[PDB]
Design a protein around this ligand. Structure first.
Ligand SMILES: [K+]
Ligand SMILES: [K+]
Ligand SMILES: [K+]
Ligand SMILES: [Mg+2]
Ligand SMILES: [Mg+2]
Ligand SMILES: [Mg+2]
Ligand SMILES: [Mg+2]
Ligand SMILES: [Mg+2]
Ligand SMILES: [Mg+2]
Ligand SMILES: [Mg+2]
Ligand SMILES: [Mg+2]
Ligand SMILES: [Mg+2]
Ligand SMILES: [Mg+2]
Ligand SMILES: [Mg+2]
Ligand SMILES: [Mg+2]
Ligand SMILES: [Mg+2]
Ligand SMILES: [Mg+2]
Ligand SMILES: [Mg+2]
Ligand SMILES: [Mg+2]
Ligand SMILES: [Mg+2]
Ligand SMILES: [Mg+2]
Ligand SMILES: [Mg+2]
Ligand SMILES: [Mg+2]
Ligand SMILES: [Mg+2]
Ligand SMILES: [Mg+2]
Ligand SMILES: [Mg+2]
Ligand SMILES: [Mg+2]
Ligand SMILES: [Mg+2]
Ligand SMILES: [Mg+2]
Ligand SMILES: [Mg+2]
Ligand SMILES: [Mg+2]
Ligand SMILES: [Mg+2]
Ligand SMILES: [Mg+2]
Ligand SMILES: [Mg+2]
Ligand SMILES: [Mg+2]
Ligand SMILES: [Mg+2]
Ligand SMILES: [Mg+2]
Ligand SMILES: [Mg+2]
Ligand SMILES: [Mg+2]
Ligand SMILES: [Mg+2]
Ligand SMILES: [Mg+2]
Ligand SMILES: [Mg+2]
Ligand SMILES: [Mg+2]
Ligand SMILES: [Mg+2]
Ligand SMILES: [Mg+2]
Lengths: 243, 254
RNA sequence: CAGUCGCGUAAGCGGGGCAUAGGAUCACAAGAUACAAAAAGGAAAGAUCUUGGAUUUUUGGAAAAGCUACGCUAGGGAUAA
RNA sequence: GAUGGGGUAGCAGAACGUUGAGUGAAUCUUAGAUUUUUUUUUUAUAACUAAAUAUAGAUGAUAACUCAAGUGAGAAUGGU
RNA sequence: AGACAACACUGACUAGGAUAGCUGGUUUUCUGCGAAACCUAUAAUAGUAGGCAAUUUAAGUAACAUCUUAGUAGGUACAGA
RNA sequence: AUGUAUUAAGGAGAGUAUAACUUAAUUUAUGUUUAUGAUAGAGGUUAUCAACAUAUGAACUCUUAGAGAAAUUACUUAAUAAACGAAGUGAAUUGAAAUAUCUUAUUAACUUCAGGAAAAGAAAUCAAACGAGAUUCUAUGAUUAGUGUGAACGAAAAUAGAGCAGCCUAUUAAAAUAAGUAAAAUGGCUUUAAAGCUGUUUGAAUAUUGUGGGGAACCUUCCUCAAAGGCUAAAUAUAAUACAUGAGUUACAGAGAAAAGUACCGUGAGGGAAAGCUUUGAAAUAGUAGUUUUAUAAGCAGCUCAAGCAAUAAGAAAGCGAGAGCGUACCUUUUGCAUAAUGGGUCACCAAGUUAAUUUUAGAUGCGAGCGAAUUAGAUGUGCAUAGUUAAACCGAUCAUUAAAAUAAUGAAUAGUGUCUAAAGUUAGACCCGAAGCCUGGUGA
């Protein structure tokens, strides 16, 4: 009658409860499904125990190692970037930066060591955009530039991305200048903000520098190279000829 | 239709003065007994205290000495006096203070909230009135009570009588189930009236209402502002990208 | 299938022996791979491939001698008088 | 004019009962609620009919649905 | 004399802190299906693991069983020297 | 049981108006309100017919001067439990299916010292090329990095919350900025090889104008901090008291104790009860009554067949049962038990797959390439999934092996997430009962 005396869950939601050792006609009495007087009835068997036979992890050993230094990149495909621009969830008229990529829901809700653009759906991508990520595939770079757009790969960290979304750091696709001829214009730009902003870090390791220093990745340090210089900090392009 | 009307009456005379419009997904949802169940059982779990405690054989007082020799006595071998087989032993699987609370997604709890309002709306058990919802006690009594002329005995005996004959005339008293008044803030007359005469109904503040409270009495008498605030805080499954939330169709004839 | 060597006029044969009787991991040692390199440049210590030394003979792989008639506990009558 | 029917270890499904809780400020009770019994009926681990005895208006009992378990004992040379 | 050290002494009593691959016990009803006591490994042989495989219920079936017809492998009974 | 508040030395002996508490064992006063309180009488033992607040007299003996066989002696205005804290010392049971390393475990326990808390504390700290900014407590990070042959052990950064406080002129009275120190070799502890602690033998430097320490073997550059001198509340631990709450208990429950560490046992350390009320009266058991059967018979005492007896009366037969036949209790454990194998005198009650965290599956259901959570304007808060591949990165709808590469070959590609119900794996007592023994501290001639 009363609504509160008529509520229930769906019948399929309810499952039988098994109370063991409560009589013979229950089907689980006097042994509770254990058997007759074995180790499995008196006590407990270790889970890693196989009776004494050596496990395969010992007879064969553990293979390989786990890379604790590899960066965890958020993978973004052109197939998905196009689906967002058409739906109106990403503005193609403005620069597409990690802040706009994270706040769009296109890579999810988890921030990781970086964002990499991949080339799934490169045949149907024909929207001119100005995107900036940490890495990009050789297929995505051509698809973005073939449609009349621009792409730049910049160095980021898991902490830098958080500050970008939080608004504590302003985005910039250029490295910090070096020299006494830029200290003034850079200090003035900071005073004009009237708010404490954290700088975006630049690469420090050999690999990270070489990555953003070559034009194949459209790295934001590639402008520091000469037309004949190599991105590597150690290797050089040898010379051809008879000498 | 995507929207449903909501009439706003003047509580004393119940004169329909204004007309608002809400979404069908607010006050016209289907009756889901399984979703209302999960919400009602979800609130009871959180209300439970869960402090019962019993002692095990590892907490019962006394020494852990061996009672009888292992053999030679002709009796059954025994270990400690705190064994469950012994007179004052410890209950093996007895109650312990734990958390009986369960989880329920904010979107399911918000659907169960609007489903309870829709159950009352489609049945005519949801009466929306204008703000300022309080029992119109006589001015003579109100003047005496403040002055201090009336004793506590007589002051409470009058409120119990007036509230009774008042609810019985409106067919809102114990005979017709009961009524639950929901207001945004506490009101002296309303709350004091049903604190002394609770058989005729009860009054609650919007912050104290539960899904179960929207299904106990015979009617829900809620204020225009409390309803709008009640639905605005329990539509997580709707405003995610809005719908009509208090759209005034007919304004009060000032 | 790829690589590149032998024999053969050729077709073709060849990834030891007419067939059936030689144990791993770990650690250690010798070569290669260019993977990662705990601020950074190196390195150390690691990873992958090839290879070597074993009555690891209780040979799916513990570094291991006895007495109790002063004996004790849990069990078996699943094996005795 | 459907098919099927013994059962240990064991696996599975469906239910009853016990204690407390929500609906419950509900429902019923000297025109007899409740009474450890007896009795009657009903495919029935349960409830019900009636009888006898005593006498409560709620610190009483209670259907239905649901929630949670110190929830079901002829077996431990078990304990009191 | 392994004698005595306050019921106990091949090491007392008491309080605190264990395990037991062994033994015993494990409580309501109805319904459906229904084994094994074999193999392999083990410091194993009263134990345990993996199989064979009991159960639940979905997805398949050119499924599985049996007979018929034609075909094939292999050397027992028998018979023989 | 938890939470909140307050407080910060505990017991005993004997005596006394038997609600009244210290030989004064029911002291003497003040103020206010007194039925619209608080939360026009009677009554000094025929008493305390008044509550709140503020004062006040008295308050013995021992623990507790010395001594001693505590509650005595002899003197005298003699007086401080437990738990919690820090350091020092430091096991074994146990697990690894044995066992030494390991684990148990910077554990239990003991000793010293100290306060209401103690300890710790304002970077010779962490990070990583951006920055954070003392200590303490809780959760996540984390069955992670990592260590270990194994079994297992196990961080930090950061995040969230509780609290927040900085200083040396420390709100209590301290430094002329620290040399046998940093550090090394060696023996150990800790531990990842660094850092940190340490016995023995040795033994530096002087500040970003780059002096010293650290950034996990080690060197270097850079960054970061500034040892060998100190002060500091709060959040925390423990105990007592009061109050609040309860799908907590309601007398074999709750606690060991509804009159309890009492009675009683023990030389002793120590062990340690029973017992509520005026209600109800189950079973077992005992003596009778009614009906019925029984002194020719070899019944696990039931089942099948069943004469007869049984209602003072119209109606209504429950029960007991002569006689005939069938049937060797139950459980456990076993190839197999009436077995002369196990267990039980009967009845009643107590008495055994539970809870937590973590990791999964089925069904149901919410949302949906997102899910969940959390939130004048902004930001903020674990996680999982969204792309695979390899030992691994680069790479990427492609990747790996092919010492160059190449459709030459082989393998691997498309809905998740949260909740409930139930069953589960893992770690914890882990379904319940039961050893002999090992270690530490105490007790006793
Ligand atoms: K002991
Ligand atoms: K160093
Ligand atoms: K991945
Ligand atoms: Mg069974
Ligand atoms: Mg089982
Ligand atoms: Mg099972
Ligand atoms: Mg058994
Ligand atoms: Mg078994
Ligand atoms: Mg108890
Ligand atoms: Mg629940
Ligand atoms: Mg380095
Ligand atoms: Mg072997
Ligand atoms: Mg073999
Ligand atoms: Mg002899
Ligand atoms: Mg049959
Ligand atoms: Mg059957
Ligand atoms: Mg009765
Ligand atoms: Mg028994
Ligand atoms: Mg001798
Ligand atoms: Mg002796
Ligand atoms: Mg069958
Ligand atoms: Mg067989
Ligand atoms: Mg072995
Ligand atoms: Mg065994
Ligand atoms: Mg003295
Ligand atoms: Mg004295
Ligand atoms: Mg071992
Ligand atoms: Mg690891
Ligand atoms: Mg200094
Ligand atoms: Mg030193
Ligand atoms: Mg060191
Ligand atoms: Mg140092
Ligand atoms: Mg380093
Ligand atoms: Mg200093
Ligand atoms: Mg008791
Ligand atoms: Mg009782
Ligand atoms: Mg009881
Ligand atoms: Mg009786
Ligand atoms: Mg006779
Ligand atoms: Mg016999
Ligand atoms: Mg017997
Ligand atoms: Mg017996
Ligand atoms: Mg019980
Ligand atoms: Mg039980
Ligand atoms: Mg199931």
């Amino acid at each position: 009658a009363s609504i509160l005396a008529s509520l229930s869950d769906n019948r399929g939601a309810y499952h039988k409860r098994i109370r063991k050792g409560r009589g013979p006609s229950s089907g689980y009495g006097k042994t509770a499904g254990r058997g007759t007087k074995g180790q499995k009835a008196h006590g407990h068997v270790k889970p890693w125990f196989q009776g004494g036979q050596t496990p395969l992890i010992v007879s064969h050993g553990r293979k390989g190692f786990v890379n604790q230094f590899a960066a965890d990149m958020s993978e973004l495909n052109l197939e998905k970037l196009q689906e967002w621009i058409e739906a109106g969830r990403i503005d193609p008229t403005k620069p597409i930066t990690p802040k706009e990529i994270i706040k769009s829901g296109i890579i999810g809700s988890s921030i990781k060591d970086g964002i990499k653009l991949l080339g799934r759906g490169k045949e149907s991508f024909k929207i001119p955009v100005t995107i900036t990520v940490s890495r990009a595939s050789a297929s995505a770079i051509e698809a973005i530039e073939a449609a009349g757009g621009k792409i730049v790969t910049r160095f980021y960290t898991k902490e830098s991305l958080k500050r970008l979304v939080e608004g504590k750091s302003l985005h910039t696709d250029k490295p910090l200048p070096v020299g006494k001829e830029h200290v003034e214009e850079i200090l003035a730009q900071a005073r004009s903000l009237k708010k404490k902003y954290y700088r975006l870090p630049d690469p420090t390791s050999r690999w990270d520098i070489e990555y953003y220093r070559d034009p194949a990745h459209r790295g934001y340090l590639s402008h520091q190279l000469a037309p004949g210089e190599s991105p590597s900090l150690y290797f050089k392009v040898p010379t051809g000829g008879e000498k | 239709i995507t929207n449903v009307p909501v009439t706003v009456y003047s509580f004393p005379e119940l004169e329909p003065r204004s007309l608002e419009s809400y979404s069908a997904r607010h006050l016209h949802l289907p009756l889901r007994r399984d979703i209302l169940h999960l919400a009602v059982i979800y609130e009871g779990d959180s209300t439970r205290r869960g402090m019962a405690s019993t002692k095990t054989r590892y907490e019962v007082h006394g020494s852990h000495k061996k009672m009888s020799p292992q053999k030679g006595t002709g009796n059954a071998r025994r270990g400690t006096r705190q064994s469950p087989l012994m007179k004052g032993g410890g209950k093996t699987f007895g109650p312990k203070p734990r958390d009986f609370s369960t989880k329920l997604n904010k979107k399911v709890y918000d659907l169960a909230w609007r489903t309870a309002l829709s159950y009352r709306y489609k049945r005519g058990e949801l009466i929306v009135t204008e703000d300022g919802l309080d029992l119109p006690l006589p001015n003579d009594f109100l003047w005496l009570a403040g002055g201090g002329k009336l004793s506590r005995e007589l002051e409470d005996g009058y409120v119990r009588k007036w509230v009774h004959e008042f609810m019985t005339s409106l067919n809102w008293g114990k005979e017709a189930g009961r009524t639950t008044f929901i207001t945004g803030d506490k009101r002296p007359n309303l709350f004091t009236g049903f604190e002394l005469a609770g058989a005729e109904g009860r009054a609650l503040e919007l912050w104290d209402v539960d899904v179960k409270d929207l299904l106990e009495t015979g009617r829900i008498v809620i204020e225009r502002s409390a309803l709008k605030e009640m639905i605005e805080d329990h539509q997580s499954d709707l405003v995610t990208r809005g719908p009509n939330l208090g759209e005034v169709l007919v304004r009060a004839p000032r």
